[PDB]
């Protein structure tokens, strides 16, 4: 349902509001490492000529199949590399599309998972995501 | 009569010299029609004027430093000790019918020569016309700029008046004298002794009417021969490739255009020589070494030199009983400029590593670094030129002269950097504007409201459009894109009649249909040729 103050306009677009002083975006991470991750995603995706994506959320059973499910929402799933991390289930799954095949990602993905988990074991989620995106983007090469 | 006569003359010419193949090859030479490719023409045409009027001036000028008493018509100078050269310059001004007009046309043509060479150099630099195989032609052009500068300098110094004598003393004498080891030797070789010599005006006259014009004529001939036989460059466009030249043939369109531009340039120069006073040397007086005026400035193309002398902060060195004056810096300054002007194509080749054969020009927006560099150079030149004029600027636009000097000193470092930054960003922004027009199409300016209240500006796609509607993104091909819908044939046919009374609607219909069909035919021909070569 629509939350408090949300309206479906005549153009179909949704018009939401925020309580005075509250936040439209309240990700549980600092702005600086969010900027770092955004830069890593943008420049790694430009360097590998393939869109990169990071997912944080539950995966349920068969984390592989869940990551297959969620990569459909990437704007260009075929040219995409999605790193899905379920921190409560402690699961990591890299999923890469048909266009990104044999492009250096075959070795990068296990190395990406290794970097992610290695940085994770200290307790830094965003740092691990940044490291995994960086190493995967280094591994993948433009078509 | 004048048909059989032309046929007979052609037959005789072809039997004696058989030039038909070569002449036809010259008549069918294609020349691109861009307006900027006319800039060089200006520098040529004014030069021709400088020759003609110049020859006229040689019929009355006497290049002597011998002292005389004026004894002429101009009363404010009668009984005044002057030189024979200054006396004959006054005689040209006052005693010869049309002498003042020819003098003013000649000096205005010298100014037009310098300014047109600068604008042509700007075009060549920013469009990348200096690249391979056209580097030697850039070197020739740079030598021509230097020679023209020194030619104008030696020219306005020929009438030995107070202003030009001050200019000779300051630049030709002080800087030459101050140089190390061979400086005074150079000064005494050139002046034949100390500065107020006797063989200076004749020497400059022989350098100025014969020597430098001869060298300039040889270099201009080589320049134009190179342009003729290394065919002209062109901008990217519809039928334009690295292997063709698209435009008009020499006969008759190009010849008529060039002759008419020559006529109109001569007309501009004549109007200026009539209606604007340049170098009124009777007001300046003859040159005496003991007296000077406040507004001591050379012609504009030399002002930067003097400006570079004004702003450099009095740095001198005294090694082991010798002196290296401040003026040495000025000389080095000049040399650096000249050197960096002559070697630029090779410097850019060494930096970018690009040694490819080029015939399609670059738009200045597509080369942001070089455009920023040239903007830096132009800004520094303009700052030096206006620093030369800071005394008049401070007298008219009330400012402390010391304040102007310090503004120049800080500026000749700060302003080039600011100009580089702004020009680089501006060029990239122009590229982004072109990209937006390719992605979305020409913005028409019409805005409409949808039934749900969405304001949308009508866009005009420049190519194919997808199934429902959105431009199919074109690819930039290095050519200008329309950005106003008026430039496309939107609303462009008023009544065909005179300015005050119309013609019958049938003639209007016929002329409009003819225009429409001719434009369609031209577009179709260009498109078929472009497809054929692709």
């Amino acid at each position: 349902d629509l939350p408090y103050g949300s309206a479906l306009t005549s153009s179909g677009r949704i018009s939401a509001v925020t309580e005075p002083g509250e936040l439209s975006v309240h990700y549980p991470f600092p702005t600086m490492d969010l900027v770092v991750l955004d830069d890593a995603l943008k420049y790694g995706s430009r360097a590998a000529k393939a869109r990169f994506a990071v997912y944080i959320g539950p995966l349920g059973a068969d984390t592989a199949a869940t990551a297959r499910e969620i990569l459909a929402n990437v704007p260009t799933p075929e040219n995409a590399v999605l790193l899905a991390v379920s921190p409560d289930q402690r699961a990591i799954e890299v999923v890469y599309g048909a266009d990104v095949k044999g492009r250096g990602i075959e070795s990068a993905a296990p190395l990406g998972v290794s970097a992610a988990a290695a940085s994770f074991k200290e307790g830094n989620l965003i740092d691990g995501l940044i490291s995994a995106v960086r190493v995967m983007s280094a591994g993948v090469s433009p078509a | 009569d004048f048909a059989k006569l032309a046929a007979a003359q052609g037959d005789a010419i072809d039997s004696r010299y058989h030039p038909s193949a070569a002449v036809r090859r010259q008549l069918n030479k294609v020349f691109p029609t861009h307006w900027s490719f006319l800039l060089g023409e200006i520098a040529l045409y004014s030069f021709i004027i400088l020759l003609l009027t110049g020859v006229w001036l040689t019929l009355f000028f006497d290049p002597s430093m011998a002292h005389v008493t004026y004894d002429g018509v101009y009363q404010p100078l009668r009984g005044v000790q002057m030189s024979r050269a200054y006396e004959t310059a006054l005689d040209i001004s006052f005693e010869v019918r049309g002498g003042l007009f020819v003098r003013q046309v000649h000096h205005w043509a010298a100014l037009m020569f310098a300014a047109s060479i600068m604008v042509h150099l700007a075009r060549i630099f920013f469009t990348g016309a200096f690249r391979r195989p056209r580097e030697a032609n850039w070197v020739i052009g740079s030598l021509l700029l230097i020679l023209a500068m020194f030619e104008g300098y030696f020219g306005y110094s020929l009438p030995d008046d107070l202003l030009s004598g001050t200019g000779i003393r300051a630049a030709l004498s002080g800087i030459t004298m101050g140089m190390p080891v061979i400086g005074t030797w150079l000064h005494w070789a050139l002046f034949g002794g100390d500065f107020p010599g006797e063989i200076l005006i004749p020497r400059l006259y022989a350098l100025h009417i014969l020597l430098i014009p001869g060298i300039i004529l040889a270099l201009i001939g080589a320049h134009l021969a190179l342009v003729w036989f290394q065919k002209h460059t062109q901008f990217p466009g519809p039928g334009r490739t690295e292997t063709n030249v698209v435009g008009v043939r020499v006969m008759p369109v190009f010849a008529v255009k060039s002759g008419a531009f020559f006529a109109m340039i001569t007309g501009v120069l004549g109007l200026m020589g009539g209606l604007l006073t340049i170098n009124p040397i009777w007001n300046l007086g003859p040159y005496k070494p003991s007296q000077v005026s406040a507004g001591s400035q050379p012609d504009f193309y030399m002002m930067w030199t003097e400006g570079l002398a004004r702003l450099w902060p009095a740095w001198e060195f005294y090694p082991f009983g010798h002196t290296i004056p401040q003026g040495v810096w000025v000389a080095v300054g000049m040399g650096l400029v000249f050197a960096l002007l002559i070697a630029y194509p090779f410097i850019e080749k060494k930096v970018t590593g690009d040694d490819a054969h080029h015939n399609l020009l670059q738009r200045p927006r597509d080369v942001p670094v070089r455009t920023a560099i040239g903007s830096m150079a132009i800004a520094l030149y303009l700052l030096l030129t206006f620093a030369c004029m800071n005394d008049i600027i401070a007298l008219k636009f009330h400012i402390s002269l010391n304040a102007t000097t310090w503004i120049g000193r800080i500026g000749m470092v700060v302003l080039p950097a600011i100009v580089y930054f702004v020009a680089y960003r501006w060029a990239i922004s122009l590229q982004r504007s072109d990209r937006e027009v390719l992605e979305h199409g020409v913005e028409t300016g019409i805005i409409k409201r949808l039934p749900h209240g969405a304001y949308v500006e009508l866009h005009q796609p420049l190519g194919p459009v997808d199934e429902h509607g959105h431009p199919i993104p074109l690819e930039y091909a290095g050519a200008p894109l329309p950005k106003r819908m008026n430039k496309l044939g939107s609303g462009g046919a008023p009544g065909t009649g005179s300015f005050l009374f119309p013609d019958p609607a049938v003639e209007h219909e016929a002329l409009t249909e003819a225009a429409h069909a001719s434009e369609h035919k031209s577009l179709t021909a260009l498109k078929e040729h472009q497809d054929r070569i692709h």
């Binding site: - | 636009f397 028409t444 019409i446 409409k448 409201r449 304001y455 106003r484």
Partner: protein, 139 residues
């Protein structure tokens, strides 16, 4: 546009009362008689508001009601093409620079600079007014 003309009519009435009251109140009781300075400004302020309001009333009397002026109307009433709006232009900055050149010439009283500034103003206004009417270059 009844309300616009009504606003300007109200302003015109008040300004006419102010001007006439000032003229009467200073013709008597003021040292020099009619002040001749405030009175002129108030009278022509009445003239300004009168011109604007009277023109708006001529517009509104021959105008059928627009959506904007009609309460309880739908957005769909306003559908269609609005007029023309310039998407971009670099002529305004040149016009302002030309006016500034002329103003600097007139401040320092340099007649040549005033003439050059007016020439630049005319050229840049020509560019602005002609911007969206120059047809294709005919070759």
């Amino acid at each position: 546009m009844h309300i616009e003309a009504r606003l300007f009519e109200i302003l015109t009435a008040f300004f006419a009362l102010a001007a006439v009251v000032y003229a009467v109140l200073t013709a008597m009781f003021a040292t020099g008689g009619v002040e001749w300075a405030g009175t002129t400004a108030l009278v022509l302020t009445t003239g300004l508001t009168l011109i604007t309001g009277t023109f708006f009333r001529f517009v509104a009397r021959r105008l059928d009601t627009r959506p904007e002026d009609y309460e309880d109307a739908e957005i769909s009433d306003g559908a269609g093409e609005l007029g023309f709006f310039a998407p971009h232009s670099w002529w305004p900055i040149l016009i302002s620079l030309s006016f500034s050149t002329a103003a600097v010439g007139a401040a320092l009283w340099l007649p040549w600079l005033i003439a050059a500034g007016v020439a630049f103003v005319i050229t840049s206004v020509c560019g602005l007014v002609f911007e969206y009417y120059w047809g294709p270059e005919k070759h």
